[PDB]
């Protein structure tokens, strides 16, 4: 009522956007705005003065640097790197053969949160995350796992060494922003994959050094270890190579859970070929047997890629239905493709 | 809203 027509005059019409530097118990807070402007502002209005905290945006009325209120504004790039979304279409039911492989990690992600009764009544509580690995170039094959975990709860994917040692650090502080922001959105899940921080060699741009990459991995550990953050943000880790990964990681976390990715067997290979050819119409003479027998240790996206080129040449003939002959020669483009490289 | 009412009503002494 009258207060809205009052405080606006004092804070109106213009007011500077300021930054809270530090707080003095007088209700006077040392503030900062461009450039080098410190001051004492004692106001009882809009505050919330407890939750302000230094390093945040406080309004500044031109007469004189007075704070009528506070506006928390983000945005921020790292909040944009979290979502959206996908709520992806890929269930863990769209992949096969890993039912025993998955069923545990599926529990450990849905054992808390959804269906807590057994978990909380049991007084056990292992919500420290998981760890994955698998050859030869899989792991996003386990993003066919995490792609089902993307269908529930809250999630952010941060993967690859590039986002760590890119420029001169500042070390983990990007990892710090990830951990703390995933704690702000808690509950959540952070999926790490293919940790090459030791596996990569060249420093991007001008950067150093190997040990500072090792110490930023170290602080990744301590912030995951950790002293002292109960926030979850669960952590899912994966890679191709478990060799270069240091054991300093495993005892803090993930100590309880890590899965091995096997290569598919005959019925799993056949199963996956059925999964990818479920959509595609194929000629009556298409046979999966000679396929899964002739090929050796291929995962899903390999035979999925031979489906993709089979449909490619099927479009070169403008046929909605792929022929087995063009499936064997179009296949031979990937067969020879791995035999050429 | 009541706490913000009394919160904004102290600006008369504050000014």
């Amino acid at each position: 009522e009258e207060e809205r027509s009052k405080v606006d005059d004092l804070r109106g019409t213009p007011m500077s956007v300021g930054t809270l530097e530090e707080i003095i118990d007088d209700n006077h807070a040392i503030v900062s705005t461009s450039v080098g402007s410190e001051h004492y502002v004692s106001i009882l209005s809009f505050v919330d003065k407890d939750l302000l905290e230094p390093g945040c945006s406080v309004l500044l009325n031109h007469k004189v640097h007075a704070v009528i209120g506070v506006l928390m504004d983000d945005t921020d790039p790292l909040v944009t790197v979290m979502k959206v979304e996908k709520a992806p279409q890929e269930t863990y039911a769209d992949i096969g053969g890993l039912d025993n492989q998955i069923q545990e990690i599926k529990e450990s992600v849905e054992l808390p949160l959804t269906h807590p009764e057994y978990y909380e009544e049991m007084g056990i509580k292992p919500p420290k995350g998981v760890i994955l690995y698998g050859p030869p170039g899989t792991g996003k094959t386990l993003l066919a796992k995490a792609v089902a975990n993307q269908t529930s709860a809250t999630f952010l994917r941060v993967v690859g060494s590039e986002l760590i040692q890119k420029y001169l650090g500042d070390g983990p502080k990007l990892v710090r922003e990830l951990f703390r922001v995933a704690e702000e959105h808690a509950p959540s899940i952070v999926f790490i994959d293919e940790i090459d921080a030791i596996g990569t060699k060249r420093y991007d741009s001008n950067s150093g050094g190997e040990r500072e990459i090792q110490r930023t991995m170290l602080e990744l550990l301590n912030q995951l270890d950790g002293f002292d953050s109960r926030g979850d943000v669960k952590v899912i880790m994966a890679t191709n190579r478990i060799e270069t990964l240091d054991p300093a990681l495993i005892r803090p976390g993930r100590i309880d859970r890590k899965i091995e990715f096997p290569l598919p067997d005959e019925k799993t290979k056949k199963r996956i070929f059925q999964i990818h050819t479920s959509r595609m119409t194929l000629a009556d003479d298409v046979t999966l047997d000679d396929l899964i027998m002739a090929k050796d240790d291929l995962s899903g996206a390999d035979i999925k890629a031979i489906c993709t080129e089979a449909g490619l040449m099927a479009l070169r003939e403008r046929r909605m239905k792929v022929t087995n002959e063009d499936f064997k020669k179009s296949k031979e483009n990937v067969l020879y493709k791995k035999q050429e490289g | 809203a009541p706490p913000a009412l009394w919160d904004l009503a102290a600006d008369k002494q504050t000014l």
Binding site: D25, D50 | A1, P2, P3, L5, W6
Partner: protein, 692 residues
């Protein structure tokens, strides 16, 4: 017509037109229509069918054919005779359809059985008959809905079923009754007072006397007053005449006091003798209650208490003579022989002189009566009247009666109310407030009408406030109070205690009005507002209290700082937190003078724990260092030598666990009383409250 492939309406209500004539037919024509799939008018034919199976008295088929209906069963054919006829035939006939296995499976609140017995039970409870299936069937879910709005003081009664059905009967009845002002816990407060609740109270553990250990022994030894072990004593028929050994709270307070020594305890020699090197503190205030609750029982420091307070200095005698009878009375009886001798021994001419010991036997009573102490207190105060007079001691006397018994036949209110003639409006605020409220809980609606008419006469123009406050006190949480605040005087103290006491319920639900009265209320009443944090906050004080009052804490106003730190106060002392101990910093760094500073901080010290330690558990050295460093200031500023004992009142007192007081859902009577006076704290009111 009902089976015509056409979907045309209507097959409802048409049976009333031609009725007897279709009754020359049967359901046989109906069954091929409803049973055959891909046929028109499947469930619509049940609108006609529910009336034929209903008029034929058939049961669970009217249930079965009212499923998709959900509507017509309400209004259905009127003359009431076939309706209560097939209503009681359908009634006794639907429950015989139920629990036929036997022993459940139970129905099987569903939209068929419960919504239909609700639907027709509308017309059942409207005008005619009574006692529907609700008494026949056994469903407590519909028993929730069996009752209609009526005064429940009479509803304590039910059909006696087996203790099997009585246990979950009493559970679902309980959870039905919690929202409600009255709860099965009423046996405590009420009054009542008839022998029924003691009979059924000792019959709930009848007849097993071994596993009866819980609810019986804990109940007799957990009782400070004599009424429960008294009426229940006559209602406890285990053995003969030797159950009185586990009664009278002698071996009770002895056993639980030695288990408290099992779970304690407080330091004796080091602190108290190192303080005895310091001779007498200048506060003359809080040091006596130390040896009150601490010792308990020992005589040697009791003659130091006495022989000192023979000097008569101020009211310092208070906690001392309180340790006189509290020591020996810790178990029983005790001291009530020499407890009251100093009363007449010491014209008072005021409370701090002969009224202190006059308070003693009344508060140290705790279950007496017995019955001598009643007539002894009434007699001893009728001795000293003009010297009392109406003011300083009359504050504390009713606390020696109403505590022990609410429905006590003795009226000490009238004899103490003949002294009202002094006409002073001021001292009669805090005097007549808990003077008239502290005599009894009453419950008769007559008492406050009496005392309003004979007291007012007229009116006091002032006390009337507190008198409607006493009425609103008499009844408890009847929901009558939200109707009693409509006055909401410019005095406005009606609303503060009216919402304080006026609602006792587990769910707060009082946030809307408790905030609406501060947002809508006149100025300076918000000073009174946080004081309602005493009652409703027993559930979850952590979130809301330090939230709201955290804003009220750094306010420069010493009144809302004082009444805030109290507003949190004891209900905020239930448990501790890192926010409290960390917040204690710079609460004590303020440069303000006056007692409000160390009442804020030093009362904020007692919220860390209550009667817990020190051996076992939390160390006493840290308190020694905090109270030792903060006392370096002023230098005296004797209030620092008042605060150092202030925290260790509750700190080193121990020997009593609260918890809350209390877990049984009574309330401490000395706390609300005393904490109402120092709100305008001036001289000795703080020490009167320091009886604690």
């Amino acid at each position: 017509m009902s089976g015509e492939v056409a979907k045309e309406w209507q097959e409802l209500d048409d049976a009333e037109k031609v009725q007897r004539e279709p009754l020359l037919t049967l359901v046989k024509e109906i069954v091929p229509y409803n049973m055959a799939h891909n046929a028109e008018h499947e469930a619509c034919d049940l609108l006609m069918e529910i009336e034929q199976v209903d008029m034929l008295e058939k049961d669970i088929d009217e249930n079965a054919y009212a499923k998709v209906c959900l509507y017509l069963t309400s209004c259905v054919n009127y003359v009431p005779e076939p309706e209560n006829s097939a209503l009681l035939r359908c009634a006794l006939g639907v429950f015989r359809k139920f629990s036929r296995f036997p022993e459940a499976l139970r129905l099987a609140l569903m939209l068929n059985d419960m919504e239909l017995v609700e639907d027709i039970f509308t017309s059942c409870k409207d005008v005619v008959v009574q006692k529907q299936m609700a008494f026949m069937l056994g469903r407590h879910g519909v028993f929730l809905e069996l009752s209609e709005d009526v005064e429940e003081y009479e509803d304590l009664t039910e059909i006696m079923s087996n203790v099997q059905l009585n246990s979950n009967f009493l559970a679902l009845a309980r959870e039905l009754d919690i929202m409600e002002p009255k709860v099965p816990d009423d046996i405590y407060k009420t009054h009542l007072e008839n022998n029924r609740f003691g009979g059924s109270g000792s019959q709930v553990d009848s007849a097993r006397m071994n596993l009866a250990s819980s609810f019986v022994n804990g109940f007799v030894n957990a009782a400070f007053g004599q009424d429960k072990l008294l009426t229940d004593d006559g209602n406890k028929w285990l053995y003969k005449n030797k159950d009185h050994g586990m009664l009278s709270a002698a071996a009770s307070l002895g056993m639980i006091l030695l288990w408290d020594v099992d779970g304690g305890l407080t330091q004796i020699d080091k602190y108290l003798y190192s303080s005895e090197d310091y001779i007498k503190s200048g506060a003359l205030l809080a040091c006596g209650i130390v040896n009150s609750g601490v010792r308990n029982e020992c005589d040697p420091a009791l003659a130091l208490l006495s022989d000192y307070v023979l000097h008569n200095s101020n009211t310092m005698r208070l906690g001392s003579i309180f340790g006189l009878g509290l020591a020996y009375a810790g178990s029983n009886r005790e001291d009530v022989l020499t407890l009251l001798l100093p009363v007449m021994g010491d014209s008072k001419s005021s409370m701090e002189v002969a009224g202190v010991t006059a308070l003693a036997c009344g508060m140290i009573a705790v279950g007496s009566c017995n019955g001598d102490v009643t007539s002894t207190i009434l007699q001893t105060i009728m001795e000293k009247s003009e010297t009392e007079l109406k003011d300083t001691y009359a504050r504390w006397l009713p606390l020696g009666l109403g505590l022990n018994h609410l429905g006590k036949g003795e009226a000490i209110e009238a004899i103490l109310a003949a002294l009202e003639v002094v006409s002073e409006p001021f001292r009669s605020f805090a005097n007549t407030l808990v003077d008239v409220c502290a005599y009894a809980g009453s419950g008769n609606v007559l008492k406050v009408q009496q005392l309003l008419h004979i007291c007012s006469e007229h009116f006091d123009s002032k006390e009337k406030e507190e008198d409607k406050d006493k009425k609103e006190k008499k009844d408890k949480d009847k929901k009558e109070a939200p109707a009693d605040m409509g006055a909401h005087q410019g005095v406005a103290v009606l609303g503060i205690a009216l919402i304080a006491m006026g609602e006792e319920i587990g769910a707060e639900m009082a946030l809307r009005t408790f905030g609406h009265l501060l947002r809508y209320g006149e100025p300076t009443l918000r000073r009174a507002v946080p004081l309602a944090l005493a009652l409703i906050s027993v559930s979850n004080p952590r979130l809301n209290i330090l939230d709201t009052l955290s804003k009220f804490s750094h306010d420069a106003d010493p009144e809302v700082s004082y009444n805030s730190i109290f507003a949190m106060g004891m209900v905020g002392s239930g448990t501790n937190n890192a926010r409290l101990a960390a917040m204690l910093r710079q609460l004590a760094q303020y440069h303000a003078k006056d007692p409000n500073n160390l009442f804020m901080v030093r009362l904020a010290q007692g919220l860390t724990h209550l009667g817990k330690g020190t051996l076992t558990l939390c160390p006493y050295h840290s308190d020694r260092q905090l109270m030792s460093q903060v006392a370096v200031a002023g230098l005296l500023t004797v209030l620092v030598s008042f605060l150092d004992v202030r925290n260790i009142i509750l700190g080193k007192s121990h020997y009593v666990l609260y918890g809350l007081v209390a877990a049984m859902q009574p309330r401490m009577l000395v706390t609300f009383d005393e904490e109402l006076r120092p709100l305008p704290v001036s001289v000795r009111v703080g020490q009167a409250v320091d009886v604690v």
